[PDB]
Amino acid sequence: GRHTVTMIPGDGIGPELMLHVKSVFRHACVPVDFEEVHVSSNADEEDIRNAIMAIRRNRVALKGNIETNHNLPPSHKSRNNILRTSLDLYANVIHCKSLPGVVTRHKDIDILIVRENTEGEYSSLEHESVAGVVESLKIITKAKSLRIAEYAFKLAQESGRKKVTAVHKANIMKLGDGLFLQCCREVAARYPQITFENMIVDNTTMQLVSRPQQFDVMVMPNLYGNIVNNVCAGLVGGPGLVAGANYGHVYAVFETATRNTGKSIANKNIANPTATLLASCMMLDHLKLHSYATSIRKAVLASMDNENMHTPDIGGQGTTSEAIQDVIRHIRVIN
């Protein structure tokens, strides 16, 4: 009764972290088999089309991060963004919760950020039909704004959270963000137990810095370039701590909340594994393996309470392997 899920090593610290996931999995006796599929940095699409076929087959994937090159031709669209649109993974969920072990400027933070993941900035169309003038054309729809709002409230209700906050720029973009805001309202009616509020993205960034404890669940269209996601990651400790997940009606792809490949620290045994590990935990919850996920997650959080196991990114002096060693140590205890 073992599951088969696609693994994408990706670039940078990706592959090395994937190996640690495997070893942790073997030691926790989790019933999962990893079917590896690689995605390099050539133009040729078939590198990315093969992964599509693999994920369609297995319906669940865990991945590292693909290196991005903003010096390549506009015909070369982002691999990760093709992956999300092609598989219709419309719900991007990121849990930015404070870790007791990690010292920051803000404490008691617990935010669930839900973001549209198929339109908006992914729909972007640029053309230079007149020399020296670049025009862009984005799309936002009623159908996709409803599903992302429908997902947030359902996730809000089932997680036992009280409030969903819509973040928008409807003061500037009357028609677009106004439609999104109205689509959130339509859903808000069918969830009377959930408090529904909305906030301008400008104000939302300022509040995040000053009083981020006010936010519960946040739902937003795919604009503003992941400002909210990253501000919140920075808030709780950084890109080494936060996990991300991409849900569709059928498919699901799990990863870190950041797109950073960590090129500069790759193969030095110093990368923070907790982001990827918590992501693997989210993946296990999706596969209905709730016992195995709680075991690993608890082991990660516990080893994080110890500052000696901390990696250089959060100020500690431990190595990746040493961190994994303590993670595995906590799993063997509860078994």
Added chain:
Amino acid sequence: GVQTVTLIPGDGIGPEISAAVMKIFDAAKAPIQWEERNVTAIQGKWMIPSEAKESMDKNKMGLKGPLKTPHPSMNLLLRKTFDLYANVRPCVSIEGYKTPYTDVNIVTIRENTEGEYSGIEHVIVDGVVQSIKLITEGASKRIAEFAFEYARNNHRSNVTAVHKANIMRMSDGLFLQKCREVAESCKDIKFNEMYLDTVCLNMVQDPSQFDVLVMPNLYGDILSDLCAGLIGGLGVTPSGNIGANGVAIFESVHGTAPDIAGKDMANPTALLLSAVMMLRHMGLFDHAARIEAACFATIKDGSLTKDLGGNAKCSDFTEEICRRVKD
């Protein structure tokens, strides 16, 4: 000699706080005389009255309070009519006023013509809305040239271009392209490029690394407001808009706050600090330095306005600064 500056007191707290700056400029005995114009919209064919335009066109320096937003925004009309294309927001931590961030000292320079501003939005078919923005080769170059010009003059040492060229490949690519051109001709200033999200990620963590940031207006003032959040908010943040023809209008980003409008509770700090910016743009540095020091000293002491958690009043707070300046 005395130079003359067009004053546009705003709405709500606008006249109140304008009043306070003048009072302090007077206590500071600074060579400034205020030519007040109260500009409201007239004609569509919307425009600001000629008498206001000529006033600004002559004096070159404007100071303005918050404007109520009603057809086309007045702010919009100002931007277009004087071609204000560079928005400057210097965000520096306040010693009297404690936030989780203390080491903050940044200048955010943003393009002020295109992007959101040039946007057209429309319904394509029911339930489908499309947004149209643009960036030009000319406008990116202009803002970059300004960015390095500002860095050199204001004794700043690093300029960082903030982009999202992974997604806005063509638009942000063209922006970087021009920032690089200008960096080549201005090697005194250390230049790098960062993605918007990484900048936000790092800003939250340690804003001490950043110096001067330049960006296009595809995203609006979100990042500058992020920085304002770091130093205590919109109550204390100066803003300046620099345009064509040597015109420069300095303003406050905080709103009108009408519910508080009477009773002089309002905090005139932001508008004052904007005037300090204005003084320096003019080159009245000593005066800028004194008025600023008095304002910082007055806060560090605590006589604070309610929003800063003082029980003190606008008049007192202004009065206290006035008194300090004189020595």
